[PDB]
Amino acid sequence: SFCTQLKRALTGIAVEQDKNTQEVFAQVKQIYKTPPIKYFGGFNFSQIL
């Protein structure tokens, strides 16, 4: 069962990659969004929004 355990290891790696992305980015409960007005006290976030 060399092939089966190689396949198992690769599947585990793939699932781990998905988990890594989920842990890094899905830290926010709700998808917030800024109001249509874009005056944040003089700071200009247009290049990152």
Ligand X SMILES: *[C@@H]1O[C@H](CO)[C@@H](O[C@@H]2O[C@H](CO)[C@@H](O)[C@H](O)[C@H]2NC(C)=O)[C@H](O)[C@H]1NC(C)=O
* Residue ranges in contact with ligand X by CB under 6 A: 44, 46-47
- Amino acid sitting at position 19: K
Size of the site for another protein (CB under 8 A): 36
- For residue 4, the partner it binds in ligand X, another protein, none, with Cβ less than 5 to 8 A by kind, is none
Residues 6-45, mask of contacts with another protein (x by CB under 8 A): x--xx--xx-xxx-xxxxxxxxxxxxxxxx-x--xxxxxx
Q: CB–CB of 26/34 below 8 Å?
A: no
Residue tagged 């990152």 (tokens): 48
Q: Is 28 helix (H, G, I), strand (E, B) or coil?
A: coil
Q: How far is the CB of 41 from ligand X (least distance, A)?
A: 11
Residue tagged 């585990």 (tokens): 12
